[PDB]
Design a binder for this molecule. Structure first.
Ligand SMILES: N[C@@H](CCCC[NH3+])C(=O)O
Ligand SMILES: O=C(O)CCC(=O)C(=O)O
Ligand SMILES: [Cl-]
Ligand SMILES: [Fe+2]
Length: 244
């Protein structure tokens, strides 16, 4: 892997950093060469065609919000994509992300959450309100419908995830919600542990595909509280309720 990332100047890193901290999210498409983005879209399609699994559940640890989408789990992506695992460890990608985040990124200590592909396809599909166990995700928007079909990201930064008492609606009541429209081929960088977020349910059948690479910050390397809520890797986790 040779020319993954465009070079960002000092003032570009300042502007991206500022937005990333203020909003919990910033668009980083300009950082990744179009060919690389085209290669990832092709890889995700190949992975989905072989391994897509359906999820339809509500998650107890996020106030029973919905997860309705197909997925490709992390160990399956890792075992079958040298492109994705190479990019995940690529200095030319991690260096500027560390500059934007203002801290060092580490491989996710949980093998089941390095990577995730999701595909929303049905009217009503959604990635319901939630936070991440880890600090960082790079989200590759490989395919997104037009703005009026839905699938927009909503964020509330500067919050946190209390699995025993999530109080997601209180966080909405107490903070403005920011809404983002991403197009096919966009990439964004998200502070997932402190940014409450979701995708707006699709208004009609269509296709929305992202790839998620998740990294740990130093704060993530210490022991975490165990919860049986890791639904993307196993729908039968005890925190998950199947949908009526
Ligand atoms: N915590 C997320 C899952 C992230 C999996 C990929 N890092 C959720 O509840 O939907
Ligand atoms: O679908 C998206 O744009 C973001 C998905 C998300 O929240 C995640 O992958 O953890
Ligand atoms: Cl997340
Ligand atoms: Fe997320």
């Amino acid at each position: 892997l040779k020319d993954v990332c465009a070079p960002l100047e000092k003032d570009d890193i300042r502007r991206l950093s500022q937005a990333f901290h203020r909003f919990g999210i910033v668009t980083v498409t300009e950082l990744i060469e179009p060919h690389t983005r085209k290669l990832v879209r092709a890889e995700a399609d190949r992975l989905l065609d072989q391994y897509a699994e359906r999820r339809d559940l509500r998650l107890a640890t996020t106030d029973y919000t919905r997860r309705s989408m197909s997925v490709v789990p992390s160990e399956t992506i890792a075992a079958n994509s040298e492109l994705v695992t190479g990019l995940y460890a690529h200095r030319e990608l991690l260096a500027p992300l560390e500059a934007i985040a203002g801290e060092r990124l580490h491989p996710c200590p949980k093998a089941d959450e390095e990577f995730l592909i999701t595909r929303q396809e049905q009217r009503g599909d959604t990635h319901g309100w939630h936070w991440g166990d880890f600090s960082f995700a790079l989200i590759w928007v490989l395919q997104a419908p037009p703005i009026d079909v839905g699938g927009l990201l909503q964020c509330v930064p500067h919050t946190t995830w209390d699995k025993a008492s999530p109080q997601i609606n209180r966080y909405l009541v107490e903070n403005p919600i920011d809404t983002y429209h991403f197009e096919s081929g966009d990439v964004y960088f998200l502070r997932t542990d402190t940014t409450l977020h979701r995708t707006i349910p699709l208004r009609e059948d269509t296709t929305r595909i992202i790839l998620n690479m998740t990294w740990a910050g130093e704060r993530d390397l210490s022991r975490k509280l165990a919860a049986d809520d890791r639904w993307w890797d196993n729908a039968e986790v005890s925190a998950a309720r199947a949908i009526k």
